[PDB]
């Protein structure tokens, strides 16, 4: 049982997608309801105590051109997308860039990363 669903931008479908791990349940639709500057995410990362990652791949070939285009839509502007898991956790949609190696310090891949940051809990 793999995750298979849709990605959307502002409620507007972008493509269908699947998901390989490196986590809670992904909704049927991962909607990118907003963007965040990579700088802003860098600040949350600096203090995070968990950083979980999945890769989103286009589901089928007909989803490729859109997936690719959605990557440039994010990386152009040095931004990341914002979506949610089922349980309300913030999920960031991070396209390929230096940010992946300099800040998250992970291997870089020409893939969209889903990223959840766990910040410190209260005392």
Residue numbers in the entry: 439 to 460, 465 to 565
List sentences quoted exactly from the publication behind this structure.
Recently, the split ends (SPEN) family of proteins was identified as RNA binding proteins that regulate alternative 3′-end cleavage and polyadenylation. They are characterized by possessing N-terminal RNA recognition motifs (RRMs) and a conserved SPEN paralog and ortholog C-terminal (SPOC) domain. The SPOC domain is believed to mediate protein-protein interactions and has diverse functions among SPEN family proteins, but the molecular mechanism of these functions is not well understood. FPA, a SPEN family protein in Arabidopsis thaliana and other plants, was found to regulate the 3′-end alternative cleavage and polyadenylation of the antisense RNAs of FLOWERING LOCUS (FLC), a flowering repressor gene.
The crystal structure of the SPOC domain of A. thaliana FPA has been determined at 2.7 Å resolution using the selenomethionyl single-wavelength anomalous dispersion method. The expression construct contained residues 433–565 of FPA, but only residues 439–460 and 465–565 are ordered in the crystal. The crystal structure of the FPA SPOC domain contains a seven-stranded, mostly anti-parallel β-barrel (β1-β7) and three helices (αA-αC). Helix αB covers one end of the barrel, while helices αA and αC are located next to each other at one side of the barrel. The other end of the β-barrel is covered by the loop connecting strands β2 and β3, which contains the disordered 461–464 segment. The center of the barrel is filled with hydrophobic side chains and is not accessible to the solvent. While the overall structure of the FPA SPOC domain is similar to that of the SHARP SPOC domain, there are noticeable differences in the positioning of the β-strands and the helices, and most of the loops have substantially different conformations as well. A doubly-phosphorylated peptide from SMRT is bound to the side of the barrel, near strands β1 and β3. Such a binding mode probably would not be possible in FPA, as the peptide would clash with the β1-β2 loop. An analysis of the SPOC domain indicates a large surface patch near strands β1, β3, β5 and β6 that is conserved among plant FPA homologs. The first surface patch is electropositive in nature, and residues Arg477 and Tyr515 are also conserved in the SHARP SPOC domain.
